[PDB]
């Protein structure tokens, strides 16, 4: 969509029990839809008051730790669960496996609007930080950095630079700040061209199979592993329609009766974990919302990446 | 030029190194470990 007028940096945010179950096919880091919905919840809660439009999100993930455990004698992993309460008779309830993970991410969220000129930059930065302190990011509480050495503050970098050199200079200053992490971007063109080459190899190939080929460490005979460009992962890239769009007060047991509902299903794209100084433009690497509601296809990606 | 040399009475496997022109001590074992290492790494360098 539209380009950001400024680039706010929420600092290293600790999330204690995020949803490690991203999707029915992927586990690990939470879905980027969690971060885009979080930024839209931030806009819904302070962006209408500071007259700004917080839009887009850059995911950095300084550290990650899934609450998993590899069982004895297996190559796979399982999830450490919680003990839910008993039922009304004292019987143990049926265990529903939820993944939990401890994250330390920082969010490069793009901000544009008329509120940039009305308030100081540090003022709106402190406002959205004090709002995000009372929120949750993927089902996990945001730990607010109390009584450590020093709180990591904000810096709203203005994307409009007086030069190209000043723009690259404070961009390099920001990239040094979010440097111990690993930026997550949407790489769907590489998945599409990998589909084309794999279809050239053997026809009627799905890009589900191209995704699966880009995930696995496949071996080749002369033995040599297939090289992979970068840290290629599968991500859930939004939802696809399974149902016609129902009326607000038509579907039974919705969340609300003023919003149209539609039964949907995940869409598994591809993402790439790269170091944040590779991109040379932090105006990119932001995850936006692309609905196109008449067709379905509610999805998120990083447009203007390459 | 053989990649492994078993010293037979002393139960030592010597693997050829190319930097210095000599064999160096690889592991212990006899003919079975020698044949298994030949099957894994291939002889004749």
């Amino acid at each position: 969509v539209t380009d950001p007028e400024a680039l706010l940096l929420l600092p290293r945010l600790s999330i204690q029990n995020a949803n490690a179950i991203s999707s029915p096919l992927t586990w690990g880091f939470p879905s980027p839809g969690a971060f885009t919905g979080f930024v839209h919840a931030l806009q819904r809660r302070v962006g209408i008051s500071l007259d700004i439009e917080l839009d887009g999100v850059g995911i950095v993930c300084h550290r990650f730790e899934a609450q998993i455990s590899q069982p004895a004698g297996k190559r796979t992993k399982v999830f450490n669960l919680t003990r839910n309460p008993l039922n009304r008779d004292g019987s143990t309830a049926a265990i529903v496996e939820e993944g939990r993970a401890h994250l330390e991410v920082s969010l490069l969220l793009g901000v544009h609007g008329d509120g940039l000129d009305d308030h100081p930059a540090q003022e709106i930065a402190r406002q959205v930080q004090e709002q995000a302190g009372a929120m949750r990011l993927a089902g996990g509480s945001i730990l607010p950095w109390c009584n450590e050495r020093f709180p990591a503050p904000n810096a709203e970098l203005l994307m409009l630079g007086g030069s190209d050199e000043q723009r690259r200079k404070n961009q390099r200053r920001l990239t040094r700040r979010l440097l111990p992490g690993f930026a997550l971007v949407s790489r769907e063109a590489l998945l599409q061209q990998h589909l084309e080459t794999l279809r050239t190899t053997l026809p009627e190939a799905t890009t589900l199979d191209a995704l699966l080929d880009l995930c696995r460490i496949n071996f080749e005979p002369p033995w040599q592993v297939r090289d992979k460009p970068g840290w290629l992962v599968p991500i859930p890239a939004g939802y696809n329609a399974l149902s016609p769009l129902y009326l607000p007060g038509e579907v039974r047991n919705a969340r609300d009766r003023e919003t149209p509902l539609r039964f949907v299903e995940n869409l598994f794209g591809l993402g790439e974990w790269l170091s944040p100084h590779r991109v040379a433009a932090l105006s990119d690497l932001l995850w936006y919302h692309h609905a196109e509601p008449d067709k379905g296809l509610y999805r998120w990606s990083t447009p203007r990446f390459v | 030029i053989e990649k492994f040399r078993c010293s037979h009475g002393y139960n030592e496997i010597y693997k050829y190194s190319p930097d210095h022109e000599a064999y160096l001590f690889y592991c212990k074992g006899g003919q079975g470990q020698l044949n298994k290492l030949i099957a894994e790494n291939g002889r004749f360098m």
Binding site: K169, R172, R176, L179 | -
Partner: protein, 108 residues
């Protein structure tokens, strides 16, 4: 580019994580680096090491890293006689130039 990325990554996580680069002194720390102790020399010594690092701008780690990275190719006489060593050196020089350009701006 990836090996430069994780070298800068290792340097960054050491430089922000621990004060261990200035934990205990001696005679041997390979102190000409001055990148793994960025807040360990300026946030503690005000004019002793911070003015000895901001004007000097110690970014010389690129050529020592190139000497370490030169081991990665085989030391074959045909590999050095062919133009593959020339292509190797020009791409390595470009990537150490980028490592230089990111390593120099540590005083901002």
């Amino acid at each position: 580019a990836q090996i430069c990325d994780e070298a800068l990554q290792y340097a960054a996580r050491l430089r922000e994580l621990e004060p261990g680069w200035s934990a205990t002194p001696g005679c041997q720390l390979h102190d000409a680096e001055q990148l793994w102790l960025d807040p360990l020399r300026a946030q503690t010594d005000e004019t002793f090491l911070q003015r000895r690092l901001r004007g000097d701008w110690p970014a010389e780690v690129g050529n020592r890293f190139a000497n370490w990275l030169n081991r990665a190719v085989s030391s074959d006489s045909q590999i050095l006689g062919s133009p593959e060593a020339a292509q190797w050196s020009q791409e390595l020089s470009k990537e150490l130039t980028m490592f230089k350009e990111i390593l120099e701006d540590e005083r901002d």
